[PDB]
Amino acid sequence: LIVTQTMKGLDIQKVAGTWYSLAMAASDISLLDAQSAPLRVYVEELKPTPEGDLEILLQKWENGECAQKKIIAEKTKIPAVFKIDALNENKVLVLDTDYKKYLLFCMENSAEPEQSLACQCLVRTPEVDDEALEKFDKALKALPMHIRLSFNPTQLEEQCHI
Ligand SMILES: [N]
Ligand SMILES: [Pt+2]
Ligand SMILES: [Pt+2]
User: Fold this and answer.
1) Ligand 3 centre and the CA of 59: distance in Å?
2) Rounded distance, CA 24 to CA 33, Å?
3) List the disulfide bonds.
4) 90 CA to centre of ligand 3 in angstroms
5) How far apart are CA 136 and CA 143, in angstroms?
């Protein structure tokens, strides 16, 4: 069992725009292990829709190349929980954000979180934000992460982080 506590009172409209994947953590090493790993994904943009769904623009390394993926995340009765069907995942969970600097979120397959859970620390600007990383560490304290990666500004500004 992995238990998640998402942000109460998330206004999805105020997350719109460019983000950078500053850090990642996964329950299973193999999810992130290599450059090719199935959940090694780099957020470019969050685009909320008026009716409160969420488009996720990400980059992923598959066919020798650093390729674009669009994920449609459909809203649920919980503003911080969205339904997806991509990367073999079916849930997006928004743990926390201050809207103007950082956003923490997880994807998982609800059918098996321990082989599935991947969480990221996003920032709006391509700079290491030590506040953001500490919030990510605290949000991860009660999650059973087995791989954790943090990127430097050089890796931030890059195609699939170099
Ligand atoms: N929050
Ligand atoms: Pt909040
Ligand atoms: Pt574990």
Assistant:
1) 27
2) 11
3) 66-160, 106-119, 106-121
4) 21
5) 11
Could you tell me the maximum CA-CA distance found in the chain, to the nearest angstrom? 41
Q: Which residues line ligand 1 (CB under 6 A)?
A: 7, 96
How many residues are given for the chain? 162
- Kindly give the distance from the C-alpha atom of residue 9 to the centroid of ligand 1, in angstroms, as a whole number: 8
Q: Domain-by-domain residue ranges, the chain?
A: 1-162
Resolution, angstroms, 1 dp: 2.0
Please, which residues have CB within 8 angstroms of residue 85's CB and are 6 or more apart in sequence? none
How far CA 149 is from CA of 35, 68, 119, in Å, comes to 12, 21, 11
The dihedral over CA atoms of 160, 150, 126, 83, expressed in degrees to the nearest 10, equals 70
How many C-beta neighbours within 10 Å does residue 22 have?
26
Domain covering 1-162 in this structure, CATH number? 2.40.128.20
The tokens for 54 are 């969420």
